[PDB]
Amino acid sequence: RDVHPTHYGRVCPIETPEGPNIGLINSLSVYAQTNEYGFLETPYRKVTDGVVTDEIHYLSAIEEGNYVIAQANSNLDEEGHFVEDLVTCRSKGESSLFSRDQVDYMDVSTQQVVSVGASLIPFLEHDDANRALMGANMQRQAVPTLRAD
Amino acid sequence: SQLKLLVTRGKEQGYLTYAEVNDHLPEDIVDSDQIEDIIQMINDMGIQVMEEAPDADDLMNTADEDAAEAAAQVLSSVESEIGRTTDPVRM
Amino acid sequence: EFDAIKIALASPDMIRSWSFGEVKKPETINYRTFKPERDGLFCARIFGPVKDYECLCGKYKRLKHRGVICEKCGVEVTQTKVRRERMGHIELASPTAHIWFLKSLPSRIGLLLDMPLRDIERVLYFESYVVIEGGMTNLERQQILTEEQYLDALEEFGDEFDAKMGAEAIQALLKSMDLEQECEQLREELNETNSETKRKKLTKRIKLLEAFVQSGNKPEWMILTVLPVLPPDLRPLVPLDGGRFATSDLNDLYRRVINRNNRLKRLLDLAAPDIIVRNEKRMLQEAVDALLDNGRRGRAITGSNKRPLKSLADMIKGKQGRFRQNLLGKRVDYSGRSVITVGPYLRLHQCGLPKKMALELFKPFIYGKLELRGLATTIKAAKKMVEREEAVVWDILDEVIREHPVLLNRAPTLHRLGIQAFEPVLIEGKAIQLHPLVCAAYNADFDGDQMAVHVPLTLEAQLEARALMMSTNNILSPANGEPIIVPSQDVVLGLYYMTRDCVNAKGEGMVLTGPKEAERLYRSGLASLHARVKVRITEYEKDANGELVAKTSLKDTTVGRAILWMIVPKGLPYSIVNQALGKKAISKMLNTCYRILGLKPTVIFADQIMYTGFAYAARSGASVGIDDMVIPEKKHEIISEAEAEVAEIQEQFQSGLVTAGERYNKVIDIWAAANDRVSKAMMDNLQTETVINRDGQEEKQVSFNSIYMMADSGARGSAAQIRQLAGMRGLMAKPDGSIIETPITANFREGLNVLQYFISTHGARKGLADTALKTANSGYLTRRLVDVAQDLVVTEDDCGTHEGIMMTPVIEGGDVKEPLRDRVLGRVTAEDVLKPGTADILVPRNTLLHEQWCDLLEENSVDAVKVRSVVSCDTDFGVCAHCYGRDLARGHIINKGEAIGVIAAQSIGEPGTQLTMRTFHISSIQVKNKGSIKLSNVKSVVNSSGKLVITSRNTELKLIDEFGRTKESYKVPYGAVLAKGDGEQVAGGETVANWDPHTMPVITEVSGFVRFTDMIDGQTITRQTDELTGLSSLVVLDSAERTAGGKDLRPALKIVDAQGNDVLIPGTDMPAQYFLPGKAIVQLEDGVQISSGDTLARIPQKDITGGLPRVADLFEARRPKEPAILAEISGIVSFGKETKGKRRLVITPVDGSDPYEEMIPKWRQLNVFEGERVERGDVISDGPEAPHDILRLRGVHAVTRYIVNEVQDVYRLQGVKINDKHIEVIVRQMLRKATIVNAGSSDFLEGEQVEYSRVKIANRELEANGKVGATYSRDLLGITKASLATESFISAASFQETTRVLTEAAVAGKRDELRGLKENVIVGRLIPAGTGYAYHQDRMRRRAA
Amino acid sequence: SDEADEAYSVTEQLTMTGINRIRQKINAHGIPVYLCEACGNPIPEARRKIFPGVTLCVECQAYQERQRKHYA
Amino acid sequence: RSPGVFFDSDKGKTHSSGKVLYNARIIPYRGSWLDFEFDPKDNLFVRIDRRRKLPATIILRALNYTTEQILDLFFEKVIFEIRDNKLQMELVPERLRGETASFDIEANGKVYVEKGRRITARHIRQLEKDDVKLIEVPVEYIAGKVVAKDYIDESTGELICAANMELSLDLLAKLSQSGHKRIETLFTNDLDHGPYISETLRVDPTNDRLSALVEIYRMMRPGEPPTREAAESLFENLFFSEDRYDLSAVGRMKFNRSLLREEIEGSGILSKDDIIDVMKKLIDIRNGKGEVDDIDHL
């Protein structure tokens, strides 16, 4: 019934039907694919020693907990070098600060944590979580109008 | 009679799993229907044999009270027999 | 019409009278012409005809033959309603054991015969034999046998030997037994011989036997001979669409029974070998047993759908039987639902109602009125007129609607204000516009919540609704007299914005001729709504006897307050509106108006508050903008310093100066402190930040930041939510309760990035999940509590008693947690309240302590009143009005007829929804107030140090001031070194007790010689020597170390005097030889006399839960296994045998019988000295005290005070307000079973449990008679156990196990008298509670007359 | 009210009575002890400076917490 | 939920004390389950498909393992020597990291730690930087240990002391008469390397492979007479048949990943390697190096 620190980029953390079955009908995130086995995987930019390459790399859930993944909102100096020394990352569940030369992967784009429903909300980052949940659920019931605007 | 202290275990816990009621059974029951009937007799007096850990934080006692000693008698007796007297077909 | 309902066995004779002919064949219909086939499961001639007044022949199709039975095919020309009341019998070829009396646990054929269930189950399924009057040869009557021994003893005897098998045997047994015979034989051989389990079970059996004799039953009617069949229309075979019939399983089951019955009959005709007929009998028995209660014993027969098909019990018993859904909750006519909207234009006694809804719910009213006014000739013409909806139909509608109030109800009816009744204002629309103030009660809001309107038809119903349920009649929460009409959010913010004041607004300073001039300026535009001003207001007061005397003055107010003054009624001071009017002030305004001007002016005034509030919140234009969520500017500094803190702790961790858990704790600690600091920075920046200037420089006033206004008016919001808008939103928790170590240091005004948002998601979804579950399990507490307390009703005006309880201010830990004015308000005083010097009888002894009397109490500073309680009433089967109090939902007093049990359960289950669902947790005695000492339960010694060391146990210090009332509570620990004495003068700053928790004295009374009497060093002593001080300590050890040389000996540290004789302790024949427990810090070794109460021997060394489930357990009355062991009797304590775990402790009286032993498990640290003469109802083990013990020792009043305090504290830690009558009435419903201390002159078994009213009526009847009656012992059961044992069976079979209650009430011939509230709802008569109380009374005097 | 309005208070009680027990494990009193109450080692000055009133050396505290972690 | 091996805790909700139990299921895509449940007294109990619980090492014995190599698998060794004077011991200093010495830790003739001391990291560095390679302690330090393997007489072929034997003074007494110099006890600490399989041996009713298969068959389908190779057949088809039991390829991936196997794919049938790796990972989760699985973990 609840979210785990490996839902990141695989299952929407906010978009669920509130009511009787919360967290059982979790909806898929934007870039989430399924592994060759059946496991969900999400992309990550391969970041070698200090440069964030634009070759992407689909990590599954069992593997992502053995890498220092970057943060989607991490600046870059026109070449793929983080313009901070330390950089926000999430190594094993607990997020943290990690030095420049430790990140193993970066995130593909910042909408990769939320589902298609909860990505049409502007200013999602200024809302209570449950408010965005109710918001996605109620966007999913909108009746088409005469003149769609 | 490990059955008899199985009953007291299920009481002093307030619940029984299928694990416990598979542990403290008679080792000689092969006809599953006997297991069915006896777990029903257990639940009839308390305590209800759910299949897992829960009742952890559910503090709700409809199992009073004359049924308790009678059902304990029936359980203590089920070992004295081997069945079945419940299926007409097999009889 | 009728009266009590009798249930019992049914003979075969009575069953043959019930029927209208026997069903022989198993066929239902005729498959091509679907006439019900004769004469089977749907027989026209047995179970009535299929068409109204038409026989199945076709020959008789007119009413003119109504009543003749067609000679061609036998049917009786009648109504096919008759096809729902006839029954038919099935002649069983062999007898059959009724599975209910067979396998109910306890088996009634079993313990009516005293035969084990296994043996009857053997004889039934023919695996055995059983003798019945086995001649005068060898075998007792009940003797089982088998095939083998049977055929053997038959060689012995062909006659004088009767061993049957199967239901024939059990029947010949049941009939051959003699109830009077075995009952009196058990009498004899239980009288002349008594043994514990023997007398237990045998007197149980004789109870059952004489119950069977007292009833009209017969012992063998448990064994079916004729079987009845339900009427067809109750088990129909309805034709669905497409020639695909639908039936109920009962047709399949009846087919299965009739088939095997016929097959058995044919076998018996053929004279088959008894193997096959045995299998046939067993098959028929399984058929009947699956027809009666399928799934009971033998793996229920499954229908054609794979499914275990239902039987008669499953149509009765369980969650789905009759008793539960259609017998309690039904779909009801004249009813509709729709979406509620606001409609502020209303009064609070009306509700909008759409013309479509109104015209449709009110059809027969309009029809009758259109044909009464002549607007329509017939009723058919009236229907046509309405369905065309003509211009006069609407006017006739508005004529009908006028005074007919409609009931409005919402989905989760959590309490009795969930149903109210309004007058309908027709509303050209489609939404039920519900008045705003009422949404508090209904718990409603306008985001889609549907409400359901019901119409009351009769005149008694309209008068109930208009007199008992109108929305203007319930402005007080029935949980507590505080009103439920408090304005919520638009209106408190409008009222707040009005009654405020800038520091320099328009039109400031000017003085006004009154409030009318205030509005004449404001609307004109010459004064801001809050610009301070002097205005002349004339406020009234009801100081005299109903004389509202005016007093005028020039008050210093604002334009807003004076404009709002025009809506306040007369008798209210201007001080009520000269404040800033948040939500609390705007609630207590309504509250004072109720306490002064009664109810009508309060409803009018509340409507006026709402109108003026909406109007001036509209005029305020008070929006919210993103520029209003002002971040502080010292935020980045606070966050930076907290980050430096966590970096330094992490650095210390990297240098091995801390564990992991402690680095984590310090991180969470510094983050909590930084979060609090940012909250404070923002609130300081935001509350006063309006900085204005008048005739000069500058001056900071409270802010007008609209977010702050809505948070500070109590309109919407608080410190925390703006902490999340402006400050940082703190530490977010994952759902286990373990807080994440990095906090979101941002707000919602600045975004959260992806990680911080993903972190808030955890706790957010946890909270969402726990409200989506907390709702679905909503009325479980209220429902569980009305099962126990439903049948309770205020049934007498006064019971004339002087019992009661001593209501007192609650003072726990420090100071008062609630005054006496609350806990006494509107309860009847039991005995006279005298003044402090007692001076006269001040408060008479039957005075309804309303607000004047609460004032007149606190104006003499009383802190203890003997108030009548519900639980200590005297009336049987009810409660007298006075010993309950006043109906806090109506104000005046309880009436004869209020079903206070239901409203108590509701008043505890409603506020139970504001308590969290999952459960929940949490040096010296320095004076801090001005007052004077008072030590309670004190027995001390003033040692040579001049200090005080109290030798008692229950000694604690309370603070009593100039008036006498208790000021503060504190406990005085044992040997708490008191610098003061007792009762003398004190001030705040002189620590009254200094005591060291390291040591618990053995304080002597005498400054005498030490003496180690009975102290064997090495066998009763341990040779301790602390070489720090070099301390010669002959310490005493427990009974867990030393040898058997002094094992149960007693190390006695005694103070004798300075010549060598033992100093007797003053009062008894024991010198002061304090026998030593183990582990004692007995520093001083012998030969050193010391002060009167030094620590010669020194003993070595408030969590509260809060869930609603803590309430459920508080009521279930469970014995926590860490229970304080009270003292079964006052008197000299003493120990005994040791080292069993169960160690002996016994208390001897001066007078009574001494020997009472109790085995204290040695896991618990004992807490009473060896030779202290102990009180009654003391404590030895300390911790949880089981309430059962509190009852059995301290009495009823002590257990009620305990449970009331437990529940009240669980509700008070969140601030939920609930009265005491409710917990008291539920507690009275808890202790309503008693058992007798002496069987006495009455007709009661010794250890039998009977309802306390039964004992107390019989004993009153007996001591009014010659003898003296039973000496009872009150008992206490939980709600879940007390609501099981109840008197009716129609009631207690609705919600209990149906089969067990029905079988017991059947065997016992228990005729139910409809005098409860569940029964009279099931049967469908008037409840005895409310309006129906009068009818039930006058019908109770019709009979008995 | 609504789903989110009560869910807020459920989460808020959760967070508050989760902060408070982690913050109550913190020692705020003052009584220097100088000797780990299990092993008698001298608690160094610095590890007594961070948490005043700490009555265990870091080694014994790590042991006791490792033991706590399995609920023994 | 995918096939594979899962480790869960059942945290503080069955026992009264609150101690957690740390079971370790093995669910295959098709076949028979296998569960490994501790008990409140820290006893490994393997229960094949959900019926009655059995002691742990009975399945190991059915794998044709006996007690000595079982202890060699599930433990480290400690080697006491009769150094001509009251049984002095082999020592490596990092083992002791968390000890409370019942003696005077001394080498070079030099007391490293006074007796009674909770063994410190300080004395750790002292030992190895000074490299203590054999210590001497009193005899009641070996008085309560357990012997690793078998021990039988050179006199009459009689048992010195059985494998997995609690120690005493007479046991070392008879070892001296046997001339034994290698006391193989185990390294069991309350904190990290706890004794669990040892006590589970103590509770094991059976002693050899045939007894184990007898017990297993009596549990699987009771009533029928057992038989040596009949029980052998039942067991070796229960989790070793290509026909019956199979963790599919995803099951094998989850398995070889949940134990940190270098490979990623293999058989569809279990092995001694697999069940022993499972038991090891379980007891090392109990020790405190590892973590139970979150169920919702995607």
Ligand SMILES: [Mg+2]
């Ligand atoms: Mg709503």
Ligand SMILES: [Zn+2]
């Ligand atoms: Zn006819």
Ligand SMILES: [Zn+2]
């Ligand atoms: Zn009364």
Ligand SMILES: [Zn+2]
């Ligand atoms: Zn230590």
